[PDB]
């Protein structure tokens, strides 16, 4: 079995796994939408009660599985619980990361496309000071890029350039993964993560120097870091915080598990896992949280920044922020650095959520690494055409896989590992070879708190918010639901072919 060559490489690979578009696009929107500081107390608590414990669990299961030649959950789940149902629930460890990849890589290609056009200057005056005169040209620049529908039809007509940039983006993803763990993912991580950190820090400093009559970047930080306990009784804020923690740490994706399956059997995962987890949180709340919010707050104020955030998941990062930069000397180049930052962030994550299906084809169907990557890329490239042309197919998959799916799977893997497999032997697996030991308090959190917190969260979620979306959507949501259900059954069938091999 291939293994990471260095501890540093492993941590940066796993840090590049987590540090992605979630840190710089999702977290700002989630935080701004929920009162900044009002959002971070749940966020901090969710990290300590969900994020950290599940991080260790996923490392442990991956390492455990890798030791026996299996880095994906269909097999690992069966190793932890020899029941045919374990293999079927294990399929979600392939389905979630594949479905998330189908639209993640596309949004990743936007950041590359934008970056190219901002670098070359093919982008949309301060003499005009009315705001909408500055934001509309960037709204239209994005809407024309991805082809937002103008008429009654729910169809997207993405640019030719966007389509081509998508092809290039997958070619880049394949270029890395086709070289393996050590010489591929690990080598790119050691380059991308330094670059990512330097770009983010530079952007943070340029943003902190933004000042306008409606505020400063400082007002954005005090809005983000001013505690508030009015909404700590609000279910929506807790479910947003826990959803964000799952997504940003790549938990419930099966991706952490697959990476960890390439860690040597007796090599530490306790400190390593905690380091990658904490590195992502620093990149999230200090870098991600100090670019978009302070910029929008400084230029528009908090009320209008909160409105912008509520406007959409891409309004802030793809429209508002470049619009703000455009009012700065060299702002188009600053835009380039922002989207280049976003690209390396997403690319380091997209390669990680595609390797689960790659490792399944290598480990269970015994495909060569080369063919495993190409077939995986073809599956993602083809399926992405749903996301590229059907309006809001992106949202439907991000909901079932990237929001409901991750949480459901996170609770499933915990139950399999810590209840059925055995809390005491799971605890042994986590700490075996640990440089440090997991705080013994966390044994009880992982066994009783984390599952209760996720279980309670999923019912107040499933029987309150989702009946709304499950009843009055446009019929085209069924197209995406139909397709990703077919995907699940296709993967179930490969698991069936792998069991009988
Ligand atoms: C995988 C092949 C079948 C899927 C059909 C989608 C391929 C069509 O792709 C389309 O081709 C056009 C050519 O000008 C481009 O302008 C469009 O942006 C592109 O989306
Ligand atoms: C980074 C690689 C991008 C190569 C694809 C460029 C295709 C963009 O083609 C676009 O449409 C028309 C040409 O038919 C013209 O408006 C411009 O050449 C161009 O903006
Ligand atoms: C699934 C996404 C469909 C993408 C292409 O659907 C479009 O529909 C319109 C006719 O109603 C036309 O623009 C063309 O027939 C076709 O390009
Ligand atoms: C959940 C909150 C994180 C717990 C952090 C506690 O960390 C420490 O770990 C040690 C055991 O390993 C104990 O001896 C200490 O009392 C405890 O404070
Ligand atoms: Na992240
Ligand atoms: Na990443």
Indicate the domain borders of the chain: 7-500
Query: Tokens representing 456?
Result: 């309670």
Do residues 268 and 434 touch, judged by C-beta distance below 8 A? yes
> Of the candidates 49, 50, 52, 27, which has an alpha carbon nearest to the alpha carbon of residue 39?
27
Report the DSSP beta bridge partners of residue 374. none
The residue whose CA is least distant from atom 2 of ligand 3 is 389
> Of the candidates 7, 6, 17, 8, which has an alpha carbon nearest to the alpha carbon of residue 356?
17
Percentage helix, strand, coil for the chain under 3-state DSSP, each rounded to 5: 80, 0, 20
CA distances from 150 to 153, 157, 384, 481 (A): 8, 10, 21, 24
Does ligand 4 have an atom closer than 6 angstroms to the CB of 48? yes
CB atoms within 10 A of CB 293: 29
CATH classification code of 7-500:
1.20.1740
Cα 100–chain centre separation: 8
| Region at 251 (left for phi over 0; alpha for psi -120 to 50; beta for the rest) | beta
Could you give the angle at which helices 270-282 and 7-18 cross, rounded to 10 degrees? 40
Instruction: Ligand 1, residue 163: give the atom nearest the CA.
Output: 18
Gap between the Cα atoms of 193 and 190, Å rounded: 6
Name 293's Cβ contacts closer than 8 Å, sequence gap at least 6. 28, 31, 32, 36, 220, 221, 223, 224, 305
Sign of the torsion angle spanned by Cα atoms 392, 396, 401, 407: positive
The residue whose CA is least distant from atom 11 of ligand 3 is 153
Q: 361 alpha carbon to ligand 3 midpoint, in Å?
A: 34
Sign of the torsion angle spanned by Cα atoms 117, 118, 122, 123: positive
Name 472's Cβ contacts closer than 8 Å, sequence gap at least 6. none
Residue carrying the six token digits 């107390």: 41
Sign of the torsion angle spanned by Cα atoms 32, 33, 39, 42: negative
Q: 442 alpha carbon to ligand 4 midpoint, in Å?
A: 8
Q: Is 314 helix (H, G, I), strand (E, B) or coil?
A: coil
Query: Tokens representing 344?
Result: 């390396």
Structure letter (DSSP) for residue 390: B
Q: Which ligand is nearest to the CA of 154?
A: 3
Query: Tokens representing 267?
Result: 């090599």
> Of the candidates 30, 34, 12, 8, which has an alpha carbon nearest to the alpha carbon of residue 21?
30
Does ligand 3 have an atom closer than 6 angstroms to the CB of 390? yes
Residue carrying the six token digits 């976003």: 342
Gap between the Cα atoms of 330 and 217, Å rounded: 19
Gap between the Cα atoms of 242 and 463, Å rounded: 17
CB atoms within 10 A of CB 455: 12
H helices then E strands: how many in the chain?
A: 26, 2
Of the chain, the end-to-end C-alpha distance in Å amounts to: 19
Gap between the Cα atoms of 378 and 49, Å rounded: 38
> b/e for 27-59, b at 16 or more Cβ within 10 A?
bbbbbbbbbbbbbbbbbbbbbebbbbbbbbbbb
CA distances from 58 to 17, 69, 101, 425, 496 (A): 13, 16, 19, 15, 24
Structure letter (DSSP) for residue 23: I
Query: Tokens representing 297?
Result: 């707050």
**Exposed / middle / buried, residue 350 (Cβ in 10 Å: 0-12, 13-18, 19+):** buried
Query: Tokens representing 431?
Result: 């700490």
Q: What are phi and psi of 155, to 5 degrees?
A: -115, 145
Cα 433–chain centre separation: 29
Residues in the chain: 501
| Region at 147 (left for phi over 0; alpha for psi -120 to 50; beta for the rest) | left
CA distances from 120 to 146, 163, 199, 328 (A): 19, 18, 18, 17
CA distances from 391 to 1, 104, 124, 250, 301 (A): 42, 15, 24, 26, 31
Does ligand 4 have an atom closer than 6 angstroms to the CB of 468? no
Gap between the Cα atoms of 421 and 82, Å rounded: 9
Instruction: Ligand 1, residue 388: give the atom nearest the CA.
Output: 20
Q: 388 alpha carbon to ligand 1 midpoint, in Å?
A: 10
């Amino acid at each position: 079995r291939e293994h990471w060559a260095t501890r540093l490489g492993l941590i940066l690979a796993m840090a590049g796994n987590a540090v992605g578009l979630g840190n710089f696009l999702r977290f700002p929107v989630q935080a701004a939408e929920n009162g900044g500081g009002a959002f971070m107390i749940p966020y901090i608590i969710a990290f300590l009660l969900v994020g950290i414990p599940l991080m260790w669990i996923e490392w442990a299961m991956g390492r455990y599985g890798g030791a026996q030649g299996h880095g994906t959950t269909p097999a690992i789940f069966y190793l932890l619980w020899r029941n045919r149902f374990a293999k079927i629930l294990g399929v979600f460890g392939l389905w979630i990361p594949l479905v998330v990849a189908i639209y993640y890589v596309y949004i990743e290609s936007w950041t590359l496309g934008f970056a190219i056009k901002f670098l070359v200057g093919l982008v949309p005056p301060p003499n005009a000071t009315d705001p909408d005169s500055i934001l509309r040209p960037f709204k239209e620049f994005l809407y024309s890029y991805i082809g937002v529908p103008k008429g009654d039809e729910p169809i997207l007509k993405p640019s030719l350039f966007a389509y081509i940039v998508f092809l290039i983006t997958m070619f880049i993803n394949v270029s890395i993964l086709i070289r393996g763990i050590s010489k591929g993912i690990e080598r790119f991580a050691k380059i991308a993560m330094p670059t990512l950190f330097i770009l983010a820090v530079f952007l943070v400093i340029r943003v902190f120097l933004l000042e306008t009559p409606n505020g400063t970047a400082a007002d954005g930080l005090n809005f983000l870091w001013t505690p508030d306990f009015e909404k700590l009784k609000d279910p929506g804020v807790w479910i947003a915080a826990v959803g964000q923690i799952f997504f940003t740490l790549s938990l419930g994706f099966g991706a952490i598990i697959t990476y960890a399956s390439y860690v040597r059997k007796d090599q530490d995962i306790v400190l390593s896992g905690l380091t990658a987890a904490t590195l992502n949180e620093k990149a999230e709340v200090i870098l991600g949280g100090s670019i978009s919010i302070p910029a929008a707050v400084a230029f528009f104020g908090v009320a209008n920044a909160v409105a912008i955030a509520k406007a959409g998941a891409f309004n802030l990062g793809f429209i508002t922020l470049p619009a703000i930069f455009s009012q700065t000397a060299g702002g188009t180049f600053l835009g380039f650095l922002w989207f280049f930052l976003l690209f390396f962030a997403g690319l380091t994550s997209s390669i990680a959520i595609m390797q689960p299906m790659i490792a399944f084809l290598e480990d269970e169907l015994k495909l060569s690494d080369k063919h495993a990557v190409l077939w995986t890329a073809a599956i993602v490239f083809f399926s992405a055409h749903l996301v590229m042309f059907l309006n809001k197919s992106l949202d439907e998959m991000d909901f079932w896989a990237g929001t409901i799916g991750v949480v459901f799977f996170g609770l499933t893997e915990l139950i399999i590992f810590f209840w059925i497999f055995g809390a005491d032997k799971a605890w042994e697996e986590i700490n075996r070879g640990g440089i440090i030991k997991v705080p013994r308090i966390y044994y009880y959190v992982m066994r009783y708190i984390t599952p209760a917190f996720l279980a309670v969260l999923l019912v107040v979620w499933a029987r309150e918010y989702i009946p709304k979306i499950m009843e009055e959507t446009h019929w085209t949501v069924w197209i995406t639901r139909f397709y990703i259900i077919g995907l699940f059954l296709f993967l179930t069938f490969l698991v069936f072919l792998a069991e009988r091999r």
